[PDB]
Design a protein around this ligand. Sequence first.
Ligand SMILES: C[C@@H]1Oc2ccc(CN3CC=C(c4ccc(Cl)cc4)CC3)cc2NC1=O
Length: 351
Amino acid sequence: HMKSKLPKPVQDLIKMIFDVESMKKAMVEYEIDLQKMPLGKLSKRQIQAAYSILSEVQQAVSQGSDSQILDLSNRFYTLIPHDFGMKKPPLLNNADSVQAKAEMLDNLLDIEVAYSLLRGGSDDSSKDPIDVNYEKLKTDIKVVDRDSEEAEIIRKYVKNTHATTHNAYDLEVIDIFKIEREGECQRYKPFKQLHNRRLLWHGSRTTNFAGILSQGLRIAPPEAPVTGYMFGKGIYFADMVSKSANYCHTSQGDPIGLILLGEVALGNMYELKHASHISKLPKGKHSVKGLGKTTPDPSANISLDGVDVPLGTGISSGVNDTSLLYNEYIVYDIAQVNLKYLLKLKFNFKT
Ligand SMILES: C[C@@H]1Oc2ccc(CN3CC=C(c4ccc(Cl)cc4)CC3)cc2NC1=O
């Protein structure tokens, strides 16, 4: 084949995210039986059916028996075969059960997209599959020069926002990509001048990124239990790189991860200290801010192409009795996010 003219870092990026073995590895991590539910059998309608049962389970939890909880638990495992042998799976009887399975199903929606891109489309042996797969993403991906101002700013953001309670590892930036998803700037237009636009982190596991690049960040579907998420069904962001880096789920067994920087239009924030499982905002609000005990120092704010970058070192917010150590930001309209960069990071585990 024609061997591909993309920069090496972009080629390695494409390789990372279309890797089928990594998809399978995520699936066995969630304890999915690949014999009964293989990658090629994953479907949106089965995932949705499973979210519905999970909603039924949330119901029965909110209103207190181990009798009835069993039936519902079993129905969930019927739709998403798990790896338990001649079994009796564990009972899904609490809110952690519901959170953990909802998060798993969210992930499967991204994995199904990646796999379906990989298996739809056309097969031409005279083309580099790196080029073929790049094209499937409908995203322009550039290498940001190590020496530019934007790279300096981004590297300072990484450097200053690593939380002390997340110090079992530290981070090196391997590559910085400037990314532009087709149509997304257009989607963003009504928000592009809202007040309180901010450049924020979103980390995810590398097997989500084909999904994220091809479809954007998305909100969980109507079947998903709103209770499965601390601030209900929106798109979540952090201002501390280490908070988002934790969602990469890297390890000694795989210490390379990916994390996004997005322009997020926050406008009038609804400030909350504790769980609130909503699907719509009260009138007048554009986002939720989960108030952290620690914040990047407000006076160290820098502007990048007109957007605030909260890269100050962590100081006390002053906020008293909060469920959150660090800030969280949630929007409930996909159109309020314009993805700007993708970082590839090395995690150095100090354990
Ligand atoms: C700070 C922020 O917090 C997170 C919370 C949850 C995730 C995991 N993602 C997994 C799957 C998602 C998804 C996929 C497809 C659809 Cl259709 C809807 C939602 C979005 C959520 C990551 C983060 N990362 C953070 O940094």
